[PDB]
Paper text:
The cow antibody repertoire contains a unique subset (~10%) of antibodies possessing ultralong CDRH3s, which can reach lengths between 50 to 70 amino acids. The unique [name] structure can be separated into two microdomains where the antigen-binding disulfide-bound “knob” sits on top of a long b-ribbon “stalk” and can bind to both surface and receded epitopes. Ultimately, we isolated a total of 8 and 11 cross-clade nAbs from cow-485 and cow-488, respectively, all of which had ultralong CDRH3s, suggesting only ultralong antibodies were responsible for cross-clade neutralization detected in sera. BnAbs from cow-485 were named Bess, while bnAbs from cow-488 were named ElsE and assigned numbers based on their order of discovery.
To compare the binding interactions of the Bess antibodies with structurally characterized V2-apex human bnAbs, we determined a ~3.3 Å cryo-EM structure of [name] Fab in complex with [name] [name], in which 41/57 [name] residues were resolved, allowing for atomic modeling. (A) 3.3 Å cryo-EM reconstruction of [name] Fab in complex with [name] [name] and [name] Fab (used to increase orientation sampling). The [name] [name] forms a knob like structure, stabilized by 3 sets of disulfide bonds, and inserts down the [name] apex 3-fold axis at an angle between three N160 glycans. All three N160 glycans contribute to the interface with the antibody but at varying amounts (buried surface area between [name] [name] and N160 glycans: chain A– 250 Å2, chain E– 403 Å2, chain J: 95 Å2). This angled approach is similar to human bnAbs PG9, PG16, and CAP256-VRC26.25, in contrast to PGT145, which binds more perpendicularly with respect to the viral membrane. 3D variability analysis of the EM data reveals significant movement of the rest of the Fab relative to the [name], suggesting that [name] makes all the critical contacts with [name], and contributions from other parts of the antibody are minor. To better understand and define the epitope recognized, we chose [name] and ElsE2 as representatives to look at the effect of V2-apex epitope mutations on [name] virus neutralization. [name] and ElsE2 neutralization titers were knocked out or reduced 30- to almost 400-fold for [name] and ElsE2, respectively, when mutations at position N156, N160, and K169 were introduced.
Author numbering:
A (entry chain B): 520 to 545, 568 to 664
B (entry chain K): 520 to 546, 568 to 664
C (entry chain F): 520 to 545, 570 to 664
D (entry chain A): 32 to 57, 66 to 141, 150 to 185, 188 to 309, 312 to 323, 323A, 324 to 396, 412 to 457, ...
E (entry chain C): 2 to 52, 52A, 53 to 82, 82A, 82B, 82C, 83 to 100, 100A, ...
The structure:
Amino acid sequence: LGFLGAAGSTMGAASMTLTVQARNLLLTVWGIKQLQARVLAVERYLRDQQLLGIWGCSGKLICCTNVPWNSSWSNRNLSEIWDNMTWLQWDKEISNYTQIIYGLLEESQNQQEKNEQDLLALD
Amino acid sequence: LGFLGAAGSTMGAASMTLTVQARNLLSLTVWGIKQLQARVLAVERYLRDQQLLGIWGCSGKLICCTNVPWNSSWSNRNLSEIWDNMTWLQWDKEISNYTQIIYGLLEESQNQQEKNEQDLLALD
Amino acid sequence: LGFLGAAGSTMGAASMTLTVQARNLLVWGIKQLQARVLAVERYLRDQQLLGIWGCSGKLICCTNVPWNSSWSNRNLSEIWDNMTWLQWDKEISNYTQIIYGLLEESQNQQEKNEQDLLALD
Amino acid sequence: ENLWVTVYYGVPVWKDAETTLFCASDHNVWATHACVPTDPNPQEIHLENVTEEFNMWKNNMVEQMHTDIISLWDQSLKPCVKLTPLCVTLQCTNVTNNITDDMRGELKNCSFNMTTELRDKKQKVYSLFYRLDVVQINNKEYRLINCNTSAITQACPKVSFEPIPIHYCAPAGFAILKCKDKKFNGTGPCPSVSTVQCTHGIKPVVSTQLLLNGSLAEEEVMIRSENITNNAKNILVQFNTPVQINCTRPNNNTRKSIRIGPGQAFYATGDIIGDIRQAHCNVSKATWNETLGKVVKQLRKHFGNNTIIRFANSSGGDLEVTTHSFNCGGEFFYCNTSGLFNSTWIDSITLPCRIKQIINMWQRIGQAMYAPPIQGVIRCVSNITGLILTRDTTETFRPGGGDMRDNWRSELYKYKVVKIEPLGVAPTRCKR
Amino acid sequence: VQLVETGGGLVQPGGSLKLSCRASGYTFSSFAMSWVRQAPGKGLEWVSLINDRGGLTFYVDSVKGRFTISRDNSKNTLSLQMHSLRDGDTAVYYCATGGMSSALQSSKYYFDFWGQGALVTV
Ligand SMILES: *[C@@H]1O[C@H](CO)[C@@H](O[C@@H]2O[C@H](CO)[C@@H](O[C@@H]3O[C@H](CO[C@H]4O[C@H](CO)[C@@H](O)[C@H](O)[C@@H]4O)[C@@H](O)[C@H](O[C@H]4O[C@H](CO)[C@@H](O)[C@H](O)[C@@H]4O)[C@@H]3O)[C@H](O)[C@H]2NC(C)=O)[C@H](O)[C@H]1NC(C)=O
Ligand SMILES: *[C@@H]1O[C@H](CO)[C@@H](O[C@@H]2O[C@H](CO)[C@@H](O)[C@H](O)[C@H]2NC(C)=O)[C@H](O)[C@H]1NC(C)=O
Ligand SMILES: *[C@@H]1O[C@H](CO)[C@@H](O[C@@H]2O[C@H](CO)[C@@H](O)[C@H](O)[C@H]2NC(C)=O)[C@H](O)[C@H]1NC(C)=O
Ligand SMILES: *[C@@H]1O[C@H](CO)[C@@H](O[C@@H]2O[C@H](CO)[C@@H](O)[C@H](O)[C@H]2NC(C)=O)[C@H](O)[C@H]1NC(C)=O
Ligand SMILES: *[C@@H]1O[C@H](CO)[C@@H](O[C@@H]2O[C@H](CO)[C@@H](O)[C@H](O)[C@H]2NC(C)=O)[C@H](O)[C@H]1NC(C)=O
Ligand SMILES: *[C@@H]1O[C@H](CO)[C@@H](O)[C@H](O)[C@H]1NC(C)=O
Ligand SMILES: *[C@@H]1O[C@H](CO)[C@@H](O)[C@H](O)[C@H]1NC(C)=O
Ligand SMILES: *[C@@H]1O[C@H](CO)[C@@H](O)[C@H](O)[C@H]1NC(C)=O
Ligand SMILES: *[C@@H]1O[C@H](CO)[C@@H](O)[C@H](O)[C@H]1NC(C)=O
Ligand SMILES: *[C@@H]1O[C@H](CO)[C@@H](O)[C@H](O)[C@H]1NC(C)=O
Ligand SMILES: *[C@@H]1O[C@H](CO)[C@@H](O)[C@H](O)[C@H]1NC(C)=O
Ligand SMILES: *[C@@H]1O[C@H](CO)[C@@H](O)[C@H](O)[C@H]1NC(C)=O
Ligand SMILES: *[C@@H]1O[C@H](CO)[C@@H](O)[C@H](O)[C@H]1NC(C)=O
Ligand SMILES: *[C@@H]1O[C@H](CO)[C@@H](O)[C@H](O)[C@H]1NC(C)=O
Ligand SMILES: *[C@@H]1O[C@H](CO)[C@@H](O)[C@H](O)[C@H]1NC(C)=O
Ligand SMILES: *[C@@H]1O[C@H](CO)[C@@H](O)[C@H](O)[C@H]1NC(C)=O
Ligand SMILES: *[C@@H]1O[C@H](CO)[C@@H](O)[C@H](O)[C@H]1NC(C)=O
Ligand SMILES: *[C@@H]1O[C@H](CO)[C@@H](O)[C@H](O)[C@H]1NC(C)=O
Ligand SMILES: *[C@@H]1O[C@H](CO)[C@@H](O)[C@H](O)[C@H]1NC(C)=O
Ligand SMILES: *[C@@H]1O[C@H](CO)[C@@H](O)[C@H](O)[C@H]1NC(C)=O
Ligand SMILES: *[C@@H]1O[C@H](CO)[C@@H](O)[C@H](O)[C@H]1NC(C)=O
Ligand SMILES: *[C@@H]1O[C@H](CO)[C@@H](O)[C@H](O)[C@H]1NC(C)=O
Ligand SMILES: *[C@@H]1O[C@H](CO)[C@@H](O)[C@H](O)[C@H]1NC(C)=O
Ligand SMILES: *[C@@H]1O[C@H](CO)[C@@H](O)[C@H](O)[C@H]1NC(C)=O
Ligand SMILES: *[C@@H]1O[C@H](CO)[C@@H](O)[C@H](O)[C@H]1NC(C)=O
């Protein structure tokens, strides 16, 4: 499989196996239990894809944005984050700022998308 | 404003809350089946809307511009009235009869554009 | 032509009905839910696969993977003007997973390359 | 530095989660059609430089299996013959033919008036019953123990009670983590964690006091408890080597089919062929003594190098918890075990066993099941792979039992269910 | 750290010359690298830049259609394929480490290490 093989790797050693994890997301009571598990997996997948969509990251695994990084979220340089830290440690480190970052991403896409509409209205 | 808060606002006041409505489209065996039917239906409706955006060349966007010209036979109004006076509910009523016509044209223009793109990355 | 109407048409005679067929991918009653759930998962795997190849949102997607002559040594006219998609699917079935693997690797390199071109400044 | 938020999808990050697991497997109570085939080549990916905290006492996989096993049990019994028409006054006498003293008073010959194919005509039939299944009313008048608490369903004679390995497999978006840290004590950090598609096959072996046909410890005997100093908690002991136990029901039985009504029949125990002996189990004495010595040393590691450790038989209570209960060839044995826990630490052992036909499976009131007799002579050879002990200068340990969740904890202690959180963000220098 | 250039020599106008650079003392695959020219009597001129992975190459306009820059991370080497040499290409060609970045590490936009240089005479 290779699934989660990079879990113990550093952030810059990992994030090259993104398709490995991405492809692993996809008697009446037994049928119901199985359908609930399958429907839930589908709903979670679609919510994550919708979230990437509204940020302007649809169809990508590594998506660049226009949101500046705040030093209050993590006061670390790139060498520590990408060469020493793992993704599990990073997830713990910035858990409390996740929704703030997500909100900013949504707002920047809303401005960018509208700006494109105005640029395409010239001529 | 929250979900549908802009429903009574004008078209140009709305079309800035699209993520608010967009995020609300995804979220004893008889009770199990009833809940599953509700969840599966919500998923299928979402995917059909996304498929339409895909085939029109609008995947990943909430606002996308196209190459289909507007016909005066569908709505003979200028932008000042449509965007500053009208609401989206009134607009939906005004062009309901032409919805499938517009959709067909959108599909057709993407089919031409996609092929046109294929014939340009072929040069050289 | 409607759904599968182009099935007997040549590869270059089809490739114009892709939206027609794309539209058709979407107690005892549990059988219906199973049938509906399966269709959704199958649809999503294909969309996910297109996503990882960088072909999301498109019906025709060009890539940077060279065609290996060992997969099919034909002259393009043979493929697109005479052959149908069913015959083609049979001809290269053995190499489908090889092609898919190459497509995934190609996109990963391009995605990293794109990132490397977006902090030059 | 000028850093920008970059969004990643497919990040190898997970969080603790509780979800519904499915069942994979290779006419049977548990090998049901709902379960799907296993992967012929199971995958396991070792996670290098990963330490994950495990807690076997809060593992939702144990509760799910408990519920699923009970559900499969009831679904298996649902279509079988109901024996409500059997709850009639019995006229019982003792069986005195070729009876050894060990069996004197244990087996009764009961005659009764029961219905037949037609509702109007009745028939006089007889059946042999074990003392444990029959309660005296009002010398010769008896009733079944289930008459004043619940209707009883006869188990289908064609459905095996043999445990079949069941593998639990995660749904997509979730993962099962395996603790490969030898000598893991059931709680806390576990280095050397691997990700698997599913667990190994777990046989739903039902037993008390002694754990049969389970997994063995890789190097040392393991002593595990939620709180080792709390005498209200159970101690699970995992053996390094199995102790072989040979259990038998030596009597050669036959079976009489007595029709109750259209398409329905009760299976009565017929006359016994040959001599009547009791049931028993032979536990190798030298192996058992060595096993206890190992258990005592490991207990001393927690209770003190100079603490006297004594084994004693269980305290009183229901037969299902005071004896070693198990299903051997379709018969339910209730073995004394007192001969195994009778020593102080500082040829074989023969354990007498009783057989009962009316089984209240799972600690429930009602939903009684009647086990039909099995013809011939029953012999089982099993591996004892662990113990459930309770703690009473000197510490005393006694066999424990019940709950059933502990038997499944003894196998699922190394597995954890997590959910995948594929989205994450991180600073980079890349600007859109 | 060491960077040792090889190749070089005198090639007549219109010819072709391959230069190479052997690196040691650092992880080769972790740094972007470049080739820089120094005219025999003037200053330094940047010619070409290659990323750490080798997938991205950049050239100064004066050589954009004539020079190819290549990297082989399994051998710790750089190479430069110089076609259609003209009199203006006479220079010392230095192998240098630095110049670009890999996005997930701090930027450089400077040259950390230099070799001794190959002399190319047209
Ligand atoms: C720990 O694990 C061991 C295995 O390692 C278990 O031991 C086995 O236990 C079973 C049940 O007691 C033994 O019996 C076998 O039962 C099979 C199923 O019975 C069929 O046939 C009867 C016929 O009346 C039907 O009623 C029934 O519905 C089934 O259709 C039989 O098929 C087996 O027969 C095979 O083995 C015997 C060996 O004596 C041969 O003579 C046969 O020809 C045939 O090859 C058998 O009767 C089984 O034998 C035990 N295995 C071993 C190796 O001894 C333990 O029970 C388990 N412990 C616990 C507590 O579960
Ligand atoms: C089956 O039913 C018959 C009829 O009730 C029982 O026989 C009766 O037993 C009582 C005992 O006090 C006598 O007084 C009756 O005269 C008997 N009647 C007949 C017709 O025999 C018989 O005992 C029942 N058998 C069982 C096993 O309960
Ligand atoms: C069902 O009948 C049994 C058999 O009598 C009852 O068990 C007895 O309960 C009394 C009262 O607690 C005890 O003193 C006896 O020792 C029990 N055993 C026997 C053999 O009498 C049981 O309580 C009854 N249950 C119900 C719900 O009526
Ligand atoms: C357990 O061990 C006893 C011996 O202690 C076995 O009983 C013997 O069985 C043989 C059978 O051929 C007889 O000849 C002996 O006379 C028996 N001895 C005694 C003391 O009873 C018994 O069969 C064994 N049971 C199992 C399941 O292994
Ligand atoms: C059990 O009790 C019966 C008597 O109730 C014993 O006798 C047999 O009973 C059946 C009744 O169906 C008769 O058909 C047989 O003819 C009786 N036997 C004889 C010799 O007359 C029976 O033997 C007892 N069985 C045991 C194992 O004790
Ligand atoms: C674990 O750490 C060691 C430290 O020497 C390193 O060599 C190894 O590559 C690390 N594992 C992974 C998967 O990166
Ligand atoms: C970072 O967040 C704090 C609030 O927690 C805010 O005051 C500050 O201006 C932010 N800085 C940047 C650079 O976004
Ligand atoms: C998040 O906030 C809680 C307090 O509500 C604090 O205990 C925790 O450490 C914070 N986490 C981080 C990563 O700062
Ligand atoms: C409702 O109409 C008034 C003008 O009559 C306008 O000021 C107000 O903003 C409108 N409501 C919303 C939600 O836009
Ligand atoms: C507009 O629609 C009418 C039909 O109502 C059609 O005749 C006309 O050609 C259309 N014009 C354009 C520009 O599409
Ligand atoms: C749609 O057509 C019907 C006639 O079939 C007409 O009555 C109705 O008003 C039309 N709707 C619009 C919005 O023009
Ligand atoms: C079927 O084949 C004939 C030639 O044999 C061709 O003219 C015709 O167009 C084909 N059918 C379709 C649907 O293309
Ligand atoms: C083409 O396929 C053959 C057979 O797998 C392989 O040996 C060869 O290297 C491939 N060539 C290219 C350019 O992919
Ligand atoms: C595919 O492989 C089979 C052998 O498994 C072979 O018989 C068949 O000809 C192959 N097909 C192609 C198109 O190579
Ligand atoms: C069975 O034997 C016991 C002695 O063990 C005796 O007390 C009892 O009365 C006997 N019952 C019958 C029905 O003979
Ligand atoms: C298990 O070992 C850990 C040390 O790694 C200890 O903290 C914990 O209390 C132990 N638990 C038991 C039940 O012995
Ligand atoms: C274990 O039980 C004792 C009872 O006195 C209590 O003091 C102790 O805190 C408990 N430890 C745990 C880990 O629950
Ligand atoms: C169990 O029976 C086997 C014969 O099948 C015998 O070899 C073994 O020694 C017995 N074990 C015990 C503990 O009696
Ligand atoms: C059990 O083994 C110990 C030695 O570890 C020995 O002293 C003791 O006598 C043995 N007991 C029996 C019953 O063999
Ligand atoms: C108990 O004995 C072991 C040797 O088996 C020794 O290592 C340990 O230190 C002893 N502990 C005490 C408290 O004497
Ligand atoms: C435990 O053993 C003693 C001594 O033989 C006995 O009196 C007592 O009844 C036994 N307990 C049980 C529950 O059998
Ligand atoms: C187990 O055997 C002992 C032998 O002394 C006896 O006292 C005890 O009552 C027996 N227990 C059972 C449940 O038969
Ligand atoms: C326990 O050991 C003593 C030793 O004298 C013996 O008398 C007694 O019968 C034994 N009990 C059991 C149940 O083995
Ligand atoms: C039981 O007795 C019957 C008598 O016909 C015999 O055929 C059968 O083999 C015996 N079974 C055993 C296990 O002794
Ligand atoms: C007992 O464990 C041993 C371990 O080697 C195994 O070979 C044997 O088959 C097991 N016995 C049973 C009945 O499972």
